[PDB]
Amino acid sequence: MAEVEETLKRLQSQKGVQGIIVVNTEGIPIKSTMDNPTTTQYASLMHSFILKARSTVRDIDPQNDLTFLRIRSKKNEIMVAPDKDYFLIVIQNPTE
């Protein structure tokens, strides 16, 4: 999980990134670099969302496996990155 701690501390430096979440395969968020429940919410949602992608990638091309994601929105933005058996989250704010 340290390698992820490196894929995390990196966003930590980015601008706007206020917190990050690190869940495992079971679907339970192991670490939570945010208020307290923010990890619990993104762990029950961002968990299934990133999953709908890791699979689609194969449909369009089983050779281009997935490795990291990034979705921008209005209220803010969210960086992601599923490691070997875990996945990360990055709630960062735009224009800060």
Add this chain to the structure above:
Amino acid sequence: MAEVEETLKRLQSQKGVQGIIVVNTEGIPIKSTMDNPTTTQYASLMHSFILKARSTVRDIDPQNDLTFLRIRSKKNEIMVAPDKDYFLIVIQNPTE
């Protein structure tokens, strides 16, 4: 496609960025800063992949609609950004 030409020329500066593609709302890739058909592929698939998200953002919160996208596969990462009615496309490689 001017304001977009600004959301584009920006990536143009990025490094790994090798090309870009512009589409509208009908799904037709208006412009194409890449191969001849490479745009047709990123213009017919990037439209359905970004929809799976634009719908999720609403689920978690219909008040926080989406705004832009960005994914990272094994070869490189495809950046995107659907404006009022024109979405853009990007193909820049990671590992700066």
